[PDB]
Amino acid sequence: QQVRQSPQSLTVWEGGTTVLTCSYEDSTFNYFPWYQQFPGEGPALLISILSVSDKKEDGRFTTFFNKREKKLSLHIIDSQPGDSATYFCAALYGNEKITFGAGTKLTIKPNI
Amino acid sequence: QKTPQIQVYSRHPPENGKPNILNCYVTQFHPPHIEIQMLKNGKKIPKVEMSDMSFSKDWSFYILAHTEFTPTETDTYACRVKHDSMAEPKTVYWDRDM
Amino acid sequence: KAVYNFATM
Amino acid sequence: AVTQSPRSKVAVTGGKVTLSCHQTNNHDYMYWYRQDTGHGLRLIHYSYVADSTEKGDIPDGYKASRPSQENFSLILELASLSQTAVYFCASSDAGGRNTLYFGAGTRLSVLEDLRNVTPPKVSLFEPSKAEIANKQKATLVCLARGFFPDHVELSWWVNGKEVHSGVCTDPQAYKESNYSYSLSSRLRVSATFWHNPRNHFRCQVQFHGLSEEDKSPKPVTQNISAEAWGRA
Amino acid sequence: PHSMRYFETAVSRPGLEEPRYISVGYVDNKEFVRFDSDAENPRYEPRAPWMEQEGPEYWERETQKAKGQEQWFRVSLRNLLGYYNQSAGGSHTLQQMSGCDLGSDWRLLRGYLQFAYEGRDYIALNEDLKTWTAADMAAQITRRKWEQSGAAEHYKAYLEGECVEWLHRYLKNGNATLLRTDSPKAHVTHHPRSKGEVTLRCWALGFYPADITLTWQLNGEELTQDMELVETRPAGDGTFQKWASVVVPLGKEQNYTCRVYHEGLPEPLTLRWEP
CATH class of the missing domain: 2.60.40.10 (Immunoglobulins)
Structure with a gap:
């Protein structure tokens, strides 16, 4: 495989920070979007980032990029249960076909 | 739209009764399709090698057609070009002093 | 290396 | 707006299953993706214009059809136990780095x-x-x-x-x-x-x-x- | 003072075949790559022998890239039929130049990306690379669409980012062809134009690169307003040629000197008629 996503499956508490990771093997890749899949529904673009930026930050979502070790990541800050979805890390060069990861299944357990 | 600039000439300094290449050099046209004919003594030459198409910073097009020939004191040579930007075809005869 | 274009006109 | 139908289908192996999609985003690229276990998005086929298509990464066992600009379709000639999955349609604008727009989904049970x-x-x-x-x-x-x-x-x-x-x-x-x-x-x-x-x-x-x-x-x-x- | 540019053209065809996409790449104005839709096995192909280096992935990736562009172009034409409300029988030209000039410090000095439709300025990214300029009302829709999709950012990332990187790579890769120049050779000719006056002509031949200057002077004085001059042309071997000419009275042709300046000339060349 070409885009690696870990963990496969994740449960975290309400209020927490959440960290999804991703590593890619085509050094030449340029642009990296993240899709969000809520169950009952098909994926939808969440946040995206070029290889010239080191971080992109969309208000309690923020994606970080690292070239040297050919790795990147998504940080949710407040992590509430309206965030319980599958998240896909995506990667492509130029105008090539978007390459999608395996997915991480995020369960934000609510607080009680 | 832009009218073609034609120029007809030889690759090598022409001494008649000696093989050479005759060049027709069309430029400055928009749109890009063009009909270009190279005539010996009024009559079409069959095998005219042409250039690839390209264009320059004013967006306009330019191409080099040419065939081999052997100049003589008698035989006339020309380039005839049809393009939308021209009301009707333009011919241009060789001059071995140009 | 060639320009890749994004959104259609 | 992307919309697939049927939303759910059950099929006997060796059966013929046809899933259709439809997009009023006016896009030209259209993609049939396969999700297994809610996990991964793998390309089966796609199509950049009507009436031709192209093989993706998972083309084997799937045939595809782009009748109109708006209509793209996946065909399982003879259904198999592998092919049991959730299926996703998506459109996208031509050119690089455009966002794909997805359909709500289609679940397929193929049974012996x-x-x-x-x-x-x-x-x-x-x-x-x-x-x-x-x-x-x-x-x-x-x-x-x-x-x-x-x-x-x-x-x-x-x-x-x-x-x-x-x-x-x-x-x-x-x-x-x-x-x-x-x-x-x-x-x-x-x-x-x-x-x-x-x-x-x-x-x-x-x-x-x-x-x-x-x-x-x-x-x-x-x-x-x-x-x-x-x-x- | 360097540059790279990619000049790509797309032409509509009424009937069955589809638009035509042709993409040609120039480095320091000298063609190095090209890709044609109308070829049989359409791929990006090199054009200078120094591009023979790049490995089969290079070709494959730029090829598939350009098929990406072909379609991008197909669609963009049809959009523009709607914006201007044109009928079905037609042929239409979409073209795009895009590139990066470099300082000697290997540093981006200006970027270029623009388009034109029926050989008219449609839209173009301003110098800043954050702002477009748009010509007629139709372009003002496409600015709209591209300001919404944050297109500026992504071109910018190619112009500064990727283009500049590859211009270096090419230059070092193809060095023994970037040296080359051919000095012009040059003679004068005597063509008795009128009763009373003749025509001398300064012929420059067999020179590369393209740019050159011809100056007829009369006793330390230029006559630019009076002379006839023909825009440079290509011989076909890869060399060029160009001449200039002046009207003089019969007998007094030894006053007139012509001069020829060229990069390839170590020292500038100065010329006189002789029988």
Whole structure:
């Protein structure tokens, strides 16, 4: 495989920070979007980032990029249960076909 | 739209009764399709090698057609070009002093 | 290396 | 707006399954993706214009069709046990780095035989009734169980339309038995509404099993409901 | 003072075949790559022998990239039929130049990306690379669409980012062809134009690169307003040629000197008629 996503499956508490990771093997890749899949529904673009930026930050979502070790990541800050979805890390060069990861299944357990 | 600039000439300094290449050099046209004919003594030459198409910073097009020939004191040579930007075809005869 | 274009006109 | 149909399909192996999609985004690229276990998005086929298509990463066993600009379709000549999955349509604008727009999805059960296809059964529980006394609204539970395979859609109609609000409706099946699933959902509604007798409450499902075409009491594409009035 | 550019053209065809996409790449104005839709096995192909280096992935990736562009172009033409409300029988030209000039410090000095439709300026990214300029009302829709989709950012990332990187790579890779120049050779000719006056002509031949200057002077004085001059042309061997000419009275042709300036000339060349 070409885009690696870990963990496969994740449960975290309400209020927490959440960290999804991703590593890619085509050094030449340029642009990296993240899709969000809520169950009952098909994926939808969440946040995206070029290889010239080191971080992109969309208000309690923020994606970080690292070239040297050919790795990147998504940080949710407040992590509430309206965030319980599958998240896909995506990667492509130029105008090539978007390459999608395996997915991480995020369960934000609510607080009680 | 832009009218073609034609120029007809030889690759090598022409001494008649000696093989050479005759060049027709069309430029400055928009749109890009063009009909270009190279005539010996009024009559079409069959095998005219042409250039690839390209264009320059004013967006306009330019191409080099040419065939081999052997100049003589008698035989006339020309380039005839049809393009939308021209009301009707333009011919241009060789001059071995140009 | 060639320009890749994004959104259609 | 992307829209797929059918939303759910059951099929016998060696059968012919055709899933269609449709996009009013006016896009030219269209993509059939395959999600396994809710995990991954793998390209099967795509198409940059009508009426031709191109093989993706998972082309084997799938044929594709782009009749119109708006209509793109996946065809399973002879269905196999592998091909059981969730399927995703998507459009995108031509050019680089454009966002794909996805359809809500299509689930496909491919089965060896139609020997185990069982409808559900449907319990409407009337409220806690200590909750009136505690904090004063009625949380009427529905529950479907003992249905295989998990192709159910729980609607909660009233005397007229169906209020989407106040409906924590589950995310999936629970694998109750190997060959049985469960699914519950809980509308919550008012003191006045549901004290007063002059209210209608219906739990409903649709079970995607067999059709009349596709071929024990015939376990076809059914409805099963469960109804109730207020307690004065 | 360096540059890279990619000049791509797309032409509509009424009938069955589809638009035509042709993409040609120039480095320091000298063609190095090209890709044609109308070829049989359409791929990006090199054009200078120094591009023979790049490995089969290079070709494959730029090829598939350009098929990406072909379609991008197909669609963009049809959009523009709607914006201007043109009928079905037609041929239409979409073209795009895009690139990066470099300082000697290996540093981006200006970026270029622009388009034109029926050889008219449609839209173009301003110098800043954050702002477009748009010509007629139709372009003002496409600015709209591209300001919404944050297109500026992504071109910018190619111009500064990727383009500049690859211009270096090419330069070092193809060095023994970037040295090359051919000095012009040059003679004067005597063509008795009128009763009273003749025509001398300064012929420059067999020179590369393209740019050159011809100046007829009369006793330390230029006559630019009076002379005839022909825009440079290509011979075909890869060399060029160009001449200039003046009207002089019969007998007094030894006053007139012509001069020829060229990069390839170590020292500038100065010329006189002789019988």
